[PDB]
Design a binder for these strands. Structure first.
Lengths: 242, 242
DNA sequence: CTTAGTTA
DNA sequence: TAACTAAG
DNA sequence: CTTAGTTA
DNA sequence: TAACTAAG
């Protein structure tokens, strides 16, 4: 089936992603910013044990590395690790928000394309590398020393925009090679639209092959492939309605 | 002095006023109104004894009379009697508010008239009679039976406007007979302005004589007569300033 | 006393 | 939501 | 855990 | 002013 033909494209089979064509991102600070080091709220053993294997997996994957940084933000003591990056966000230069609202994005769907494929990318932000100069920005304490992210982190205010822009650059060629297909991108949520079941299945094969090649990974479990009706961005797409 | 020449004009000497040229006022109700009878909150003996001689004086003066009315509003249990006429006010037809704001009224004072007389009328509203058909509107309980007002009452939403309009009608002739004088009226607060101390003193004599004749009474105690500087409506009038 | 409107 | 504030 | 924004 | 509410 779909899973077997494209082992590289699916998170289930291809391993953790890494966007090989994308240069490691440099994150510019506002002109007056200096590092802020916020103390870690003491964590209960229950929370620590809950979070631990997630931290170990990320270390194993090279997504977290040890560091010493003048920056520090807290992990929430209440599992799965959630970092409060608000004080970092305040010190990072704003970028223009280029991610379209879903209502506007969907206006780009013609009544002519009614065969749909929906993919969502797994651990999307983690596919984007962070330049070593920007890594220390995102440090947190783990017990003893600090760890930090080598990839675009959750909770960082510019992650959705930077990811959406990176994927747009990576999929520019695909769009050109398949000028009849409709591809909607909302950060990590993709909808491919076609006129026929055949166009859709050939399109979908090409999109998966392309994604896998670029280093992105889709969720095989959640994939809606070549259906006349799909869920996308909390809409039900059917009869060309919605 | 001023007090002796005009015994009729001063509250101190002329007795309680009564505007003899003014027809007893009829107070129109809104189209859907019916009487409201609000129970009297029990009054402490302390309050009752405090209020009593005021009530007796008003009865002696014919300003309050006994009655039986389907209307009733409460006197406040916490001296000097204050009637809560809000439920009556809600049922009475609105009139246009014609009393100018003091800021606008004072704009009518030319730099040329800098000799001032200020009078305030004592118990102004009580000078205006209420038509017997409208008297029952304002009834309250006194202990046992009801009493009501035979004159325009305090706390009634249209009293200031109706009084201001009535006094304007009564002083229309005076204005015509003294076209050089400036007369400002703000309900019961009057300012007469003149070019010279002589004009002011002759004007003031005429205004007092006219007021006394019409049945209004000014406070001799508070009167500011023929001064180059006076207090009027919480302003200090001096040098033509304010 | 109750109550319409504002501020905390 | 509670507390004031100004009023009748 | 803290905190910016809304509602009560 | 207190209480929620959604977030990082």
């Amino acid at each position: 089936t779909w899973l077997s033909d494209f082992p590289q494209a699916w998170a289930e089979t291809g391993g953790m992603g890494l966007a090989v064509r994308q240069a490691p991102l440099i994150i510019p600070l506002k002109a007056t910013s200096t590092p802020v080091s916020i103390k870690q709220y003491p964590m209960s053993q229950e929370a620590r044990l809950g979070i631990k294997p997630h931290i170990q997996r990320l270390l194993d994957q090279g997504i977290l590395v040890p560091c010493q940084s003048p920056w520090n933000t807290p992990l929430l003591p209440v599992y799965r690790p959630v970092q409060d990056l608000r004080e970092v966000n305040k010190r990072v230069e704003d970028i223009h928000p280029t991610v379209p609202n879903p209502y506007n994005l969907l206006s780009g769907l013609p009544p002519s394309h009614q065969w749909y494929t929906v993919l969502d990318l797994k651990d999307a932000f983690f596919c984007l590398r962070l330049h070593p100069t920007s890594q220390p920005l995102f440090a947190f304490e783990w017990r003893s020393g600090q760890l930090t992210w080598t990839r675009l982190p959750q909770g960082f205010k510019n992650s959705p925009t930077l990811f959406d822009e990176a994927l747009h650059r990576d999929l520019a060629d695909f769009r050109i090679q398949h000028p009849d297909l409709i591809l909607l991108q909302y950060v990590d949520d993709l909808l491919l639209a076609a006129t026929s079941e055949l166009d859709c299945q050939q399109g979908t094969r090409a999109l998966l092959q392309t994604l896998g090649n670029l280093g992105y990974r889709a969720s095989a479990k959640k994939a809606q492939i070549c259906q006349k009706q799909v869920k996308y961005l909390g809409y039900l797409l059917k009869e060309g309605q919605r």
